[PDB]
Amino acid sequence: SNPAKPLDGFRVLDFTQNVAGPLAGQVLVDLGAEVIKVEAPGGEAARQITSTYFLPNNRGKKSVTVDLTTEQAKQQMLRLADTADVVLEAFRPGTMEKLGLGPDDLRSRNPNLIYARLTAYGGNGPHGSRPGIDLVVAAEAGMTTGMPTPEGKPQIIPFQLVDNASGHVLAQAVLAALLHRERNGVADVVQVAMYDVAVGLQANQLMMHLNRATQPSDAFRTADGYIVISAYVPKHWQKLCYLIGRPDLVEDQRFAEQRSRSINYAELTAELELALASKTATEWVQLLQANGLMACLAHTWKQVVDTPLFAENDLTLEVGTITVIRTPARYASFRAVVTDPPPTAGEHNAVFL
Amino acid sequence: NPAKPLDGFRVLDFTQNVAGPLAGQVLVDLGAEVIKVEAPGGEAARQITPLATYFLPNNRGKKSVTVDLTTEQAKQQMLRLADTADVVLEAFRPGTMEKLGLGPDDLRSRNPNLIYARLTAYGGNGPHGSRPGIDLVVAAEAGMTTGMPTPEGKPQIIPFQLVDNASGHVLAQAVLAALLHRERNGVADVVQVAMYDVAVGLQANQLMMHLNRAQPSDAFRTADGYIVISPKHWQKLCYLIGRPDLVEDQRFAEQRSRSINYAELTAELELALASKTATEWVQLLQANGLMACLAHTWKQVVDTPLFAENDLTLEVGTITVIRTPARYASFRAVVTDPPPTAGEHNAVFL
C-alpha cells in the first residue's frame, strides 16, 4: 500500500526558483500534493549551479518549460492555472502581473485558486520594492548583531537560515489557506516575506528595543577543546558544581543565584574553566550527559552527519544513488518522505501542455 | 469580523517556553481556540522575565488553565477536556505524558478526532535522543557553530533563538497538515517535531556537502562601516565602484576566480569603498538595482523605515510585540488581546 497523504489530489503551480520557494513546494510534495514546476526553457538556474542546490528541494515534482514572454505560453499557463489549487510565485512584485499571470488575472478566471507569493522584503511600499537573497536579508534584519569577528567584520552565518525558515513558513501559510478554502470556501491570497520571517526568528532580541529600551549557558574551555554547557537551573547548577569538583561554588557568595551568576560571569567562566582543565571535552560531555545535564560538543558539519544522533533520527534518505536530508515534520499515518527523483526540465511538457 | 481558517478548532497547549507556545500563537492568529495547561503557580516563563519576555508575545489570545498534573483530579479534568479538543500540543519529556495518563494512546482511544502533536529537543528515537535540550545546546550540537571564526577561538554562538522559532513554525505547519489530513482523509494523526531535526534542515545545504563524499556575496569594508554587497552585477559593481576591472585584473574575471583571490578581491573593493560613507555606498548600489545593505544591529532594525513599512508590530495591553510573519488577504492573522492570567479560564473548562 501507499497510504493516503493529506494533500493527495491537490495540484500546485510552482513558479519559484532557488531555495526558499522550492522548499515550500517540496514540503507540499512530501505531504502528497502534485507540484508542477514552471521553469524557463533550459531549466531553473539552480539545476546548473554547482554541477547540488537543486536536488534536495525538487524531488517528486513535475516540470514544464515555458517562455513567459510568449503569448502562447502565457495562454498555456492560463489554462494550466485553471486546474490548479495553489500557485507559488517568488518573483519580484509586479513581474507576475506584468506577465499577465498576476493574482487578479488568475483569481478572476479561477475563483478557487490560492495565490501564494514569496518576496525578500514584501511588496509594501518603496523600501520593500527591492530584490534579495538569504545573505542580504539576514544582514538587514540584524542577524549579525552581537557577534564579534577577529577583523571586526560582521559575522555572516554560513547557512541559509532565512531561506530555509521562510520555505517552511510559506508551506504553513499554504496549508492554512487550503484549510481556509476547505472550511470557509475562501481562496485566499497569501504573502510571506523573507524579512518578516527573519525578524520573527530574532523576535525576542528585537522585543528588548521595542518598549522604550542565563548563567551558565555558554561554551567553555577544557583540556582539549570546547564544551557547551547549559545548566543555570537551580537543581542543575548545583549538580554541575558537584560534578566538576567544586562544591564551594554551589552556595558561595557571587554565584549563588542566577542574577549574581549572570552579572558576575567572567569570574564564573574562570572558575569553571579552571575546573574543566581536568578532563577533555568529550570526557566532560559523557560525564554530564549521564547525570542529566545539558552538554554537548560544538560539532562541525562534517562531524554532525557521522554522529549516532543523526543516524537515530533517520534524517537522510537515498534517491535512486544520492543521499539527501528529509523535512523535519514527521507523521504516524504516512511517511512525509518521497523517493522519486527530480523532474528533468520540461519533462512533463505535453502532459500539461 | 470575518471567518478565519481555524475557527471552531480547540487545542490543548501543554507546551512551555518559546517553540511550542509560538506554535500555539500561530494557531491563535489563524483563529483556533487555544487553551494552555499550566502549572498551579503558572507557566513560570511569566516569572522568568518590567515585561515578561518570552511569555507575553507568544501567548496572546489564549486561555489558561491551572492544574496539578500529578493528582488524579487533574488527570480526569484533562481527560474530559481532551475530548472536546481537536489538537493537543506537548513539549514534555519523551515519556512523561504516558506516565501521566495523557499519552497519545490514552487520549486518542477516547477521542478519534484528536490530533496529538509532540515537540522534542532530539526526537526520543533512541538512547542518544533520550536527553533534555535547550535552544543553545541543540543549535551547537546540530553544527550551527561551524565556519564562524571568533576572536577568542571559542565557538561562535548565535545570540538569538533561531532553532526555537523555526521549530515553532514547523510544528505549526505540521499541525496544519494533520488537520487537513483529518479533514480530507478522516485520519487523526500523531505528529512529531524534533528541534534537532529542524536545526539540521536549516543547514541542509551545507550538510549535503558532507553526505556524499567523492560568491561573490559578503560583507565588505567602506569609508565608514561595512556594506553587505551580494554577471551584470559584477560589471555594474565595478563600473559603479569607479573601477574598470571586470576582467581587467583577470583575477576578478569569471565568478569562479574568487578561489584564491577572494581575500584579495575584497581589498581593492575596500580601497574603492573608502571613497564615501557606507550609507552612501548602499544608496548608490540600491539605485542601480544592486543587492546591498547595512549590517543593522537589533536597535537599528526597529527604527528602520523598512520595519515600519511592513507592519511588524502590534500593541497589546501597552506593550509592543512582533506579529507572526505570514499574511492573508481574507483576514488579518493578528489578535489584539492579551495573554490570559494564570487559571483565568479554570471555571469555564474544568
PDB file of C-alpha atoms in Angstrom, chain A residues 4-10 19 27 31 52-53 56-57 121-122 124-133 135-136 139-161 164-165 167-169 171-173 175-180 182-184 186 188-193 195-197 199-211 217-219 221 226 228-230 232 289 292-302 304-305 307-310 312-313 315-316 321-326 328-334, chain B residues 3-9 18 26 30 51 53-54 57-58 122-134 136-137 140-162 165-166 168-170 172-174 176-181 183-185 187 189-194 196-198 200-208 210-212 217-220 226 228-230 286 289-299 301-302 304-307 309-310 312-313 318-323 325-331:
ATOM      1  CA  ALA A   4      -3.254   8.294   1.902  1.00  0.00           C
ATOM      2  CA  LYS A   5      -1.484  11.666   2.284  1.00  0.00           C
ATOM      3  CA  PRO A   6      -3.044  14.958   3.497  1.00  0.00           C
ATOM      4  CA  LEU A   7      -2.628  16.801   0.175  1.00  0.00           C
ATOM      5  CA  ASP A   8      -3.386  13.877  -2.132  1.00  0.00           C
ATOM      6  CA  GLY A   9      -5.112  15.134  -5.224  1.00  0.00           C
ATOM      7  CA  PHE A  10      -4.151  18.768  -4.931  1.00  0.00           C
ATOM      8  CA  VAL A  19      15.829  27.562  -2.284  1.00  0.00           C
ATOM      9  CA  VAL A  27       7.047  20.176   1.744  1.00  0.00           C
ATOM     10  CA  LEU A  31       2.529  15.956   2.037  1.00  0.00           C
ATOM     11  CA  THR A  52      23.504  20.019  -5.996  1.00  0.00           C
ATOM     12  CA  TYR A  53      21.486  23.002  -4.833  1.00  0.00           C
ATOM     13  CA  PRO A  56      17.025  18.355  -2.234  1.00  0.00           C
ATOM     14  CA  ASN A  57      14.170  20.654  -2.835  1.00  0.00           C
ATOM     15  CA  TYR A 121      11.115  42.378   1.650  1.00  0.00           C
ATOM     16  CA  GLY A 122       7.371  42.430   0.807  1.00  0.00           C
ATOM     17  CA  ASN A 124       4.533  47.045   0.639  1.00  0.00           C
ATOM     18  CA  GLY A 125       5.933  50.447  -0.189  1.00  0.00           C
ATOM     19  CA  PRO A 126       9.206  51.774  -1.638  1.00  0.00           C
ATOM     20  CA  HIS A 127      11.640  50.262   0.859  1.00  0.00           C
ATOM     21  CA  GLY A 128      10.258  46.743   0.194  1.00  0.00           C
ATOM     22  CA  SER A 129      10.485  47.224  -3.586  1.00  0.00           C
ATOM     23  CA  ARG A 130      13.941  45.606  -3.801  1.00  0.00           C
ATOM     24  CA  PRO A 131      15.249  42.139  -4.714  1.00  0.00           C
ATOM     25  CA  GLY A 132      17.024  39.974  -2.140  1.00  0.00           C
ATOM     26  CA  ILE A 133      18.830  36.760  -1.276  1.00  0.00           C
ATOM     27  CA  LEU A 135      22.555  36.778   2.986  1.00  0.00           C
ATOM     28  CA  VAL A 136      21.410  40.354   2.452  1.00  0.00           C
ATOM     29  CA  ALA A 139      22.150  41.166   7.441  1.00  0.00           C
ATOM     30  CA  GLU A 140      19.437  43.783   7.038  1.00  0.00           C
ATOM     31  CA  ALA A 141      17.151  42.195   9.614  1.00  0.00           C
ATOM     32  CA  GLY A 142      20.046  42.471  12.108  1.00  0.00           C
ATOM     33  CA  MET A 143      21.198  38.857  12.269  1.00  0.00           C
ATOM     34  CA  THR A 144      24.862  39.868  12.615  1.00  0.00           C
ATOM     35  CA  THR A 145      24.178  41.677  15.916  1.00  0.00           C
ATOM     36  CA  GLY A 146      26.250  40.763  18.962  1.00  0.00           C
ATOM     37  CA  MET A 147      28.826  38.532  17.326  1.00  0.00           C
ATOM     38  CA  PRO A 148      32.429  39.718  17.037  1.00  0.00           C
ATOM     39  CA  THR A 149      34.848  38.796  14.263  1.00  0.00           C
ATOM     40  CA  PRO A 150      38.654  38.988  14.694  1.00  0.00           C
ATOM     41  CA  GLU A 151      38.805  41.517  11.871  1.00  0.00           C
ATOM     42  CA  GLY A 152      35.788  43.417  13.268  1.00  0.00           C
ATOM     43  CA  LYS A 153      33.675  42.474  10.251  1.00  0.00           C
ATOM     44  CA  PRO A 154      30.017  41.445  10.647  1.00  0.00           C
ATOM     45  CA  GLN A 155      29.564  37.779  11.342  1.00  0.00           C
ATOM     46  CA  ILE A 156      27.781  36.223   8.450  1.00  0.00           C
ATOM     47  CA  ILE A 157      26.098  32.970   9.156  1.00  0.00           C
ATOM     48  CA  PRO A 158      27.227  30.315   6.699  1.00  0.00           C
ATOM     49  CA  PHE A 159      23.907  28.593   6.247  1.00  0.00           C
ATOM     50  CA  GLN A 160      20.717  29.673   4.608  1.00  0.00           C
ATOM     51  CA  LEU A 161      18.672  30.099   7.754  1.00  0.00           C
ATOM     52  CA  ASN A 164      15.060  27.645   4.822  1.00  0.00           C
ATOM     53  CA  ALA A 165      12.855  29.066   7.531  1.00  0.00           C
ATOM     54  CA  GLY A 167      10.272  27.974   2.986  1.00  0.00           C
ATOM     55  CA  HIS A 168       8.647  26.277   5.915  1.00  0.00           C
ATOM     56  CA  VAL A 169       6.686  29.407   6.810  1.00  0.00           C
ATOM     57  CA  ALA A 171       4.355  25.980   3.485  1.00  0.00           C
ATOM     58  CA  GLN A 172       2.487  26.785   6.647  1.00  0.00           C
ATOM     59  CA  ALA A 173       0.574  29.594   5.009  1.00  0.00           C
ATOM     60  CA  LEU A 175      -1.724  24.752   4.397  1.00  0.00           C
ATOM     61  CA  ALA A 176      -3.674  27.341   6.418  1.00  0.00           C
ATOM     62  CA  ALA A 177      -5.029  28.755   3.153  1.00  0.00           C
ATOM     63  CA  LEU A 178      -6.059  25.260   1.976  1.00  0.00           C
ATOM     64  CA  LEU A 179      -7.883  24.661   5.270  1.00  0.00           C
ATOM     65  CA  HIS A 180      -9.462  28.084   4.920  1.00  0.00           C
ATOM     66  CA  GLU A 182     -11.964  23.797   2.716  1.00  0.00           C
ATOM     67  CA  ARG A 183     -13.903  25.058   5.760  1.00  0.00           C
ATOM     68  CA  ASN A 184     -14.841  28.580   4.729  1.00  0.00           C
ATOM     69  CA  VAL A 186     -12.235  31.180   0.626  1.00  0.00           C
ATOM     70  CA  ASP A 188      -7.045  33.426  -0.120  1.00  0.00           C
ATOM     71  CA  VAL A 189      -4.035  35.435  -1.243  1.00  0.00           C
ATOM     72  CA  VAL A 190      -1.059  34.555   0.953  1.00  0.00           C
ATOM     73  CA  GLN A 191       2.100  36.601   1.355  1.00  0.00           C
ATOM     74  CA  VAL A 192       5.259  35.652   3.102  1.00  0.00           C
ATOM     75  CA  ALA A 193       8.259  37.936   3.166  1.00  0.00           C
ATOM     76  CA  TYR A 195      12.437  39.875   6.024  1.00  0.00           C
ATOM     77  CA  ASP A 196       9.331  39.114   8.062  1.00  0.00           C
ATOM     78  CA  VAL A 197      10.461  35.613   8.903  1.00  0.00           C
ATOM     79  CA  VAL A 199      12.576  39.345  12.050  1.00  0.00           C
ATOM     80  CA  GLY A 200      10.466  36.640  13.613  1.00  0.00           C
ATOM     81  CA  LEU A 201      13.448  34.447  14.390  1.00  0.00           C
ATOM     82  CA  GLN A 202      15.088  37.262  16.373  1.00  0.00           C
ATOM     83  CA  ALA A 203      11.827  38.485  17.889  1.00  0.00           C
ATOM     84  CA  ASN A 204      12.887  38.097  21.484  1.00  0.00           C
ATOM     85  CA  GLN A 205      16.041  40.120  20.891  1.00  0.00           C
ATOM     86  CA  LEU A 206      14.132  42.722  18.919  1.00  0.00           C
ATOM     87  CA  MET A 207      11.475  42.958  21.616  1.00  0.00           C
ATOM     88  CA  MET A 208      14.009  44.471  24.006  1.00  0.00           C
ATOM     89  CA  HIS A 209      14.213  47.640  21.898  1.00  0.00           C
ATOM     90  CA  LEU A 210      10.503  47.916  21.157  1.00  0.00           C
ATOM     91  CA  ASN A 211       9.362  49.090  24.600  1.00  0.00           C
ATOM     92  CA  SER A 217      24.831  28.625  29.337  1.00  0.00           C
ATOM     93  CA  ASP A 218      27.823  29.068  27.067  1.00  0.00           C
ATOM     94  CA  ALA A 219      30.815  27.327  25.564  1.00  0.00           C
ATOM     95  CA  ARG A 221      37.338  25.689  27.502  1.00  0.00           C
ATOM     96  CA  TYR A 226      35.315  23.325  23.956  1.00  0.00           C
ATOM     97  CA  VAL A 228      28.838  23.569  25.523  1.00  0.00           C
ATOM     98  CA  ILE A 229      27.024  23.523  28.879  1.00  0.00           C
ATOM     99  CA  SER A 230      23.676  24.949  29.797  1.00  0.00           C
ATOM    100  CA  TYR A 232      21.632  27.525  35.060  1.00  0.00           C
ATOM    101  CA  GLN A 289      25.096  13.830  29.964  1.00  0.00           C
ATOM    102  CA  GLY A 292      21.084  14.524  33.302  1.00  0.00           C
ATOM    103  CA  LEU A 293      22.886  17.655  32.268  1.00  0.00           C
ATOM    104  CA  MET A 294      22.631  19.546  29.002  1.00  0.00           C
ATOM    105  CA  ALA A 295      26.044  19.494  27.490  1.00  0.00           C
ATOM    106  CA  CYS A 296      27.433  18.862  24.049  1.00  0.00           C
ATOM    107  CA  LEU A 297      30.289  19.401  21.680  1.00  0.00           C
ATOM    108  CA  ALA A 298      30.136  22.167  19.139  1.00  0.00           C
ATOM    109  CA  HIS A 299      30.157  19.746  16.256  1.00  0.00           C
ATOM    110  CA  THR A 300      31.284  20.739  12.804  1.00  0.00           C
ATOM    111  CA  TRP A 301      29.130  19.889   9.796  1.00  0.00           C
ATOM    112  CA  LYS A 302      31.478  17.021   8.854  1.00  0.00           C
ATOM    113  CA  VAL A 304      27.279  16.003  12.636  1.00  0.00           C
ATOM    114  CA  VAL A 305      26.464  13.633   9.793  1.00  0.00           C
ATOM    115  CA  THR A 307      27.093  11.108  14.797  1.00  0.00           C
ATOM    116  CA  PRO A 308      24.845   8.424  16.241  1.00  0.00           C
ATOM    117  CA  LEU A 309      22.161  11.026  16.963  1.00  0.00           C
ATOM    118  CA  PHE A 310      21.937  11.858  13.267  1.00  0.00           C
ATOM    119  CA  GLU A 312      18.961   7.724  15.185  1.00  0.00           C
ATOM    120  CA  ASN A 313      16.669  10.284  13.705  1.00  0.00           C
ATOM    121  CA  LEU A 315      17.388  12.334   8.668  1.00  0.00           C
ATOM    122  CA  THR A 316      18.730  11.011   5.391  1.00  0.00           C
ATOM    123  CA  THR A 321      22.076   6.963  -5.602  1.00  0.00           C
ATOM    124  CA  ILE A 322      22.432  10.353  -3.887  1.00  0.00           C
ATOM    125  CA  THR A 323      21.675  10.975  -0.216  1.00  0.00           C
ATOM    126  CA  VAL A 324      19.589  13.953   0.869  1.00  0.00           C
ATOM    127  CA  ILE A 325      18.158  15.254   4.147  1.00  0.00           C
ATOM    128  CA  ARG A 326      14.390  14.975   4.793  1.00  0.00           C
ATOM    129  CA  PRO A 328      11.588  17.775   9.850  1.00  0.00           C
ATOM    130  CA  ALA A 329       7.926  17.175  10.313  1.00  0.00           C
ATOM    131  CA  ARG A 330       7.093  13.549  10.980  1.00  0.00           C
ATOM    132  CA  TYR A 331       3.790  11.708  10.957  1.00  0.00           C
ATOM    133  CA  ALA A 332       2.497   8.320  12.177  1.00  0.00           C
ATOM    134  CA  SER A 333      -0.187   7.805   9.450  1.00  0.00           C
ATOM    135  CA  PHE A 334       2.216   8.144   6.467  1.00  0.00           C
TER     136      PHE A 334
ATOM    137  CA  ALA B   3     -14.169  33.756   9.133  1.00  0.00           C
ATOM    138  CA  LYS B   4     -10.669  32.502   9.898  1.00  0.00           C
ATOM    139  CA  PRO B   5      -9.244  29.121   8.809  1.00  0.00           C
ATOM    140  CA  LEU B   6      -9.158  27.572  12.274  1.00  0.00           C
ATOM    141  CA  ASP B   7     -12.491  28.906  13.563  1.00  0.00           C
ATOM    142  CA  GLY B   8     -14.194  26.296  15.720  1.00  0.00           C
ATOM    143  CA  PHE B   9     -10.996  24.388  16.442  1.00  0.00           C
ATOM    144  CA  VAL B  18       9.128  29.534  23.249  1.00  0.00           C
ATOM    145  CA  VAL B  26       0.338  30.796  15.116  1.00  0.00           C
ATOM    146  CA  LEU B  30      -5.359  31.600  12.469  1.00  0.00           C
ATOM    147  CA  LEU B  51       7.923  42.949  30.741  1.00  0.00           C
ATOM    148  CA  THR B  53       9.839  38.486  27.662  1.00  0.00           C
ATOM    149  CA  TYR B  54       9.392  35.037  26.135  1.00  0.00           C
ATOM    150  CA  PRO B  57       4.489  37.839  22.825  1.00  0.00           C
ATOM    151  CA  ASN B  58       3.611  34.183  22.219  1.00  0.00           C
ATOM    152  CA  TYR B 122      16.126  15.456  19.979  1.00  0.00           C
ATOM    153  CA  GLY B 123      13.184  13.251  18.993  1.00  0.00           C
ATOM    154  CA  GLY B 124      13.328  10.450  21.566  1.00  0.00           C
ATOM    155  CA  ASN B 125      14.036   7.764  18.959  1.00  0.00           C
ATOM    156  CA  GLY B 126      16.797   6.140  20.999  1.00  0.00           C
ATOM    157  CA  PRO B 127      19.495   6.369  23.739  1.00  0.00           C
ATOM    158  CA  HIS B 128      21.209   9.347  22.083  1.00  0.00           C
ATOM    159  CA  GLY B 129      17.927  11.212  21.725  1.00  0.00           C
ATOM    160  CA  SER B 130      16.987  10.483  25.350  1.00  0.00           C
ATOM    161  CA  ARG B 131      18.424  13.824  26.546  1.00  0.00           C
ATOM    162  CA  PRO B 132      16.784  17.114  27.567  1.00  0.00           C
ATOM    163  CA  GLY B 133      17.567  20.093  25.366  1.00  0.00           C
ATOM    164  CA  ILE B 134      17.541  23.830  25.013  1.00  0.00           C
ATOM    165  CA  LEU B 136      21.627  26.775  22.528  1.00  0.00           C
ATOM    166  CA  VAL B 137      22.601  23.186  23.205  1.00  0.00           C
ATOM    167  CA  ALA B 140      25.527  23.765  18.948  1.00  0.00           C
ATOM    168  CA  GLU B 141      25.015  20.021  18.646  1.00  0.00           C
ATOM    169  CA  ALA B 142      23.457  20.365  15.185  1.00  0.00           C
ATOM    170  CA  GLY B 143      26.588  22.131  13.936  1.00  0.00           C
ATOM    171  CA  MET B 144      25.432  25.752  13.792  1.00  0.00           C
ATOM    172  CA  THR B 145      28.724  26.979  15.194  1.00  0.00           C
ATOM    173  CA  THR B 146      30.678  25.786  12.101  1.00  0.00           C
ATOM    174  CA  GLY B 147      32.580  28.224   9.891  1.00  0.00           C
ATOM    175  CA  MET B 148      32.434  31.279  12.160  1.00  0.00           C
ATOM    176  CA  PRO B 149      35.771  32.464  13.495  1.00  0.00           C
ATOM    177  CA  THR B 150      35.843  34.187  16.829  1.00  0.00           C
ATOM    178  CA  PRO B 151      38.462  36.490  18.369  1.00  0.00           C
ATOM    179  CA  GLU B 152      38.989  34.062  21.265  1.00  0.00           C
ATOM    180  CA  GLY B 153      38.961  30.855  19.260  1.00  0.00           C
ATOM    181  CA  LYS B 154      35.749  29.982  21.138  1.00  0.00           C
ATOM    182  CA  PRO B 155      32.831  28.511  19.219  1.00  0.00           C
ATOM    183  CA  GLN B 156      30.509  31.092  17.763  1.00  0.00           C
ATOM    184  CA  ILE B 157      27.092  31.014  19.447  1.00  0.00           C
ATOM    185  CA  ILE B 158      24.202  32.676  17.600  1.00  0.00           C
ATOM    186  CA  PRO B 159      22.773  35.124  20.188  1.00  0.00           C
ATOM    187  CA  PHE B 160      19.145  34.679  19.083  1.00  0.00           C
ATOM    188  CA  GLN B 161      16.818  31.661  19.443  1.00  0.00           C
ATOM    189  CA  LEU B 162      16.648  30.580  15.754  1.00  0.00           C
ATOM    190  CA  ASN B 165      11.288  29.945  16.474  1.00  0.00           C
ATOM    191  CA  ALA B 166      11.956  27.837  13.383  1.00  0.00           C
ATOM    192  CA  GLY B 168       7.675  26.684  16.407  1.00  0.00           C
ATOM    193  CA  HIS B 169       6.802  27.361  12.799  1.00  0.00           C
ATOM    194  CA  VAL B 170       7.499  23.822  11.722  1.00  0.00           C
ATOM    195  CA  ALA B 172       2.553  24.834  13.408  1.00  0.00           C
ATOM    196  CA  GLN B 173       2.964  23.652   9.832  1.00  0.00           C
ATOM    197  CA  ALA B 174       2.823  20.046  10.949  1.00  0.00           C
ATOM    198  CA  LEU B 176      -1.952  22.268   9.951  1.00  0.00           C
ATOM    199  CA  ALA B 177      -1.089  19.289   7.762  1.00  0.00           C
ATOM    200  CA  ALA B 178      -2.621  16.968  10.298  1.00  0.00           C
ATOM    201  CA  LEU B 179      -5.850  18.989  10.372  1.00  0.00           C
ATOM    202  CA  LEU B 180      -6.032  18.942   6.637  1.00  0.00           C
ATOM    203  CA  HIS B 181      -5.262  15.235   6.826  1.00  0.00           C
ATOM    204  CA  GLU B 183     -10.406  16.858   7.028  1.00  0.00           C
ATOM    205  CA  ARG B 184      -9.723  15.134   3.700  1.00  0.00           C
ATOM    206  CA  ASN B 185      -8.878  11.578   4.653  1.00  0.00           C
ATOM    207  CA  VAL B 187      -7.427  10.337   9.936  1.00  0.00           C
ATOM    208  CA  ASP B 189      -2.548  11.587  13.153  1.00  0.00           C
ATOM    209  CA  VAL B 190       0.453  11.659  15.756  1.00  0.00           C
ATOM    210  CA  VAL B 191       2.643  14.436  14.665  1.00  0.00           C
ATOM    211  CA  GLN B 192       6.235  14.603  15.869  1.00  0.00           C
ATOM    212  CA  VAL B 193       8.619  17.541  15.605  1.00  0.00           C
ATOM    213  CA  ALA B 194      12.185  17.495  16.982  1.00  0.00           C
ATOM    214  CA  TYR B 196      17.324  18.833  16.295  1.00  0.00           C
ATOM    215  CA  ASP B 197      15.702  17.759  13.001  1.00  0.00           C
ATOM    216  CA  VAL B 198      14.533  21.327  12.350  1.00  0.00           C
ATOM    217  CA  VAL B 200      19.510  20.028  10.687  1.00  0.00           C
ATOM    218  CA  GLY B 201      17.070  21.171   7.999  1.00  0.00           C
ATOM    219  CA  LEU B 202      18.159  24.800   8.387  1.00  0.00           C
ATOM    220  CA  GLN B 203      21.683  23.769   7.465  1.00  0.00           C
ATOM    221  CA  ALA B 204      20.741  21.159   4.940  1.00  0.00           C
ATOM    222  CA  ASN B 205      22.530  22.614   2.004  1.00  0.00           C
ATOM    223  CA  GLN B 206      25.720  22.750   3.956  1.00  0.00           C
ATOM    224  CA  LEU B 207      25.138  19.300   5.425  1.00  0.00           C
ATOM    225  CA  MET B 208      24.513  17.911   1.953  1.00  0.00           C
ATOM    226  CA  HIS B 210      29.303  16.075   3.652  1.00  0.00           C
ATOM    227  CA  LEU B 211      26.705  13.481   2.839  1.00  0.00           C
ATOM    228  CA  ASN B 212      28.133  12.385  -0.431  1.00  0.00           C
ATOM    229  CA  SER B 217      28.393  37.796  -1.793  1.00  0.00           C
ATOM    230  CA  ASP B 218      29.760  39.035   1.509  1.00  0.00           C
ATOM    231  CA  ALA B 219      30.300  41.939   3.767  1.00  0.00           C
ATOM    232  CA  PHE B 220      32.964  44.392   2.796  1.00  0.00           C
ATOM    233  CA  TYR B 226      30.543  47.877   6.352  1.00  0.00           C
ATOM    234  CA  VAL B 228      26.969  43.822   2.566  1.00  0.00           C
ATOM    235  CA  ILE B 229      27.195  43.732  -1.360  1.00  0.00           C
ATOM    236  CA  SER B 230      25.775  40.478  -2.557  1.00  0.00           C
ATOM    237  CA  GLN B 286      20.465  50.089  -4.401  1.00  0.00           C
ATOM    238  CA  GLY B 289      19.202  47.542  -8.785  1.00  0.00           C
ATOM    239  CA  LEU B 290      22.111  46.051  -6.778  1.00  0.00           C
ATOM    240  CA  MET B 291      21.510  43.906  -3.636  1.00  0.00           C
ATOM    241  CA  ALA B 292      23.248  45.768  -0.856  1.00  0.00           C
ATOM    242  CA  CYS B 293      22.531  46.758   2.746  1.00  0.00           C
ATOM    243  CA  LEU B 294      23.868  47.720   6.104  1.00  0.00           C
ATOM    244  CA  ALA B 295      24.528  45.114   8.719  1.00  0.00           C
ATOM    245  CA  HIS B 296      21.985  46.532  11.083  1.00  0.00           C
ATOM    246  CA  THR B 297      22.028  45.865  14.794  1.00  0.00           C
ATOM    247  CA  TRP B 298      18.791  44.969  16.540  1.00  0.00           C
ATOM    248  CA  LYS B 299      18.391  48.504  17.918  1.00  0.00           C
ATOM    249  CA  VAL B 301      16.339  47.470  12.942  1.00  0.00           C
ATOM    250  CA  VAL B 302      13.274  48.541  14.901  1.00  0.00           C
ATOM    251  CA  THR B 304      14.150  51.480  10.239  1.00  0.00           C
ATOM    252  CA  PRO B 305      11.628  52.589   7.626  1.00  0.00           C
ATOM    253  CA  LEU B 306      11.580  49.092   6.236  1.00  0.00           C
ATOM    254  CA  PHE B 307      10.383  47.685   9.539  1.00  0.00           C
ATOM    255  CA  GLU B 309       6.558  49.713   6.239  1.00  0.00           C
ATOM    256  CA  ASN B 310       5.810  46.058   6.897  1.00  0.00           C
ATOM    257  CA  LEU B 312       5.624  44.133  12.021  1.00  0.00           C
ATOM    258  CA  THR B 313       4.474  45.326  15.407  1.00  0.00           C
ATOM    259  CA  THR B 318       0.568  48.897  26.450  1.00  0.00           C
ATOM    260  CA  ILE B 319       3.358  46.585  25.293  1.00  0.00           C
ATOM    261  CA  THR B 320       4.774  46.194  21.814  1.00  0.00           C
ATOM    262  CA  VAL B 321       5.130  42.662  20.154  1.00  0.00           C
ATOM    263  CA  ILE B 322       6.099  41.404  16.675  1.00  0.00           C
ATOM    264  CA  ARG B 323       3.475  39.602  14.812  1.00  0.00           C
ATOM    265  CA  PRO B 325       5.073  36.585   9.710  1.00  0.00           C
ATOM    266  CA  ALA B 326       2.561  35.041   7.182  1.00  0.00           C
ATOM    267  CA  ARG B 327      -0.062  37.393   5.778  1.00  0.00           C
ATOM    268  CA  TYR B 328      -3.501  36.714   4.385  1.00  0.00           C
ATOM    269  CA  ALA B 329      -5.949  38.807   2.403  1.00  0.00           C
ATOM    270  CA  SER B 330      -9.307  37.489   3.556  1.00  0.00           C
ATOM    271  CA  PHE B 331      -8.457  38.176   7.183  1.00  0.00           C
TER     272      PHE B 331
END
